[PDB]
């Protein structure tokens, strides 16, 4: 039986997410052109679409139930660990099996290998990110269980600085027996089979995929002149 | 806790 306040959470979900998430993906104009060429002429671009992608991720945590109960620090160390890993998830929406490219309407705005190598980024992460989208789009989550994800993995109690785990841990199961209820209750099998499991999996990718990009961050941070490419909210959340 | 941005973006 799914929970009435269950299918309340559902909903506040999924409306947190069409509010911070445009399928059109007009805002990206904004952002300073892609070159394509010349190294790191990408970054530019992709920089300024991390940094977009920080504030929808923080708009989305807004409305997770629960959040707002925890400290403000609690929510600074939650937002600055898993807002690389909630983008990774969150853009698996716009990844396209047919290119192995993240789809933005746009040749422009289509994102793929080479791209992402312009940014600055070694295969090292490369190879395991392309493969994490694949995993993710086999699943052919529902949006319920897409967006259910994310708030999972933005409070999660293990992440580090937290303040005080013993309440983030309650937010975050309240959210997972959600997700159990749904998949039972609202997926159907052979999808629906060891769902949970491999969602859960995901999550364990996507804290390896964060150590990888902290060292490429590092990396191509390391040096002022690339640094200065970065938003102010990027070298915020992720190094200055 | 030098993160001002990402606090006054919160609330
Ligand atoms: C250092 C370059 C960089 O962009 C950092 C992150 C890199 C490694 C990956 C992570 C996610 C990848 C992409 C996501 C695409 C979108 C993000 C999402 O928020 C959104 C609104 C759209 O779905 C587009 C594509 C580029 C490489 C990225 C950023």
């Known amino acids: 039986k799914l929970s009435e306040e269950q299918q309340h959470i559902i909903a506040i979900l999924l409306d947190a997410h069409h509010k911070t998430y445009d399928p059109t993906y007009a805002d990206f104009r904004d952002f300073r052109p892609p070159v394509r060429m010349s190294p790191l002429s990408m970054l530019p671009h992709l920089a300024d679409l991390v940094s977009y992608s920080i504030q929808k991720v923080i708009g989305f945590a807004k409305m997770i139930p629960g959040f707002r109960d925890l400290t403000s620090d609690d929510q600074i160390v939650l937002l600055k660990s898993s807002a690389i890993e909630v983008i990774m998830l969150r853009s698996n929406q716009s990844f396209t099996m047919d290119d192995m490219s993240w789809d933005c309407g746009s040749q422009d705005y289509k994102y793929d290998v080479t791209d992402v190598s312009k940014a600055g980024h070694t295969l090292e992460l490369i190879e395991p990110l392309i493969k994490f989208q694949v995993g993710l789009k086999k699943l052919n989550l529902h949006e319920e269980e897409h967006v259910l994800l994310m708030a999972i993995c933005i409070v999660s109690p293990d992440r580090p600085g937290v303040q005080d785990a013993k309440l983030v841990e309650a937010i975050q199961d309240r959210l997972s027996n959600t997700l159990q209820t749904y998949i039972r209750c609202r997926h159907p099998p052979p999808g629906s089979h060891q769902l949970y499991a491999k969602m859960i999996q995901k999550l364990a990718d996507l804290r390896s995929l964060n150590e990888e990009h902290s060292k490429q961050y590092r990396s191509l941070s390391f040096q002022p002149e690339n640094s200065m490419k970065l938003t102010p909210l990027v070298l915020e959340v992720f190094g200055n | ?11």
């Open chain 2, 1 to 11: 806790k030098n993160h001002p941005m990402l606090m006054n973006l919160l609330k």
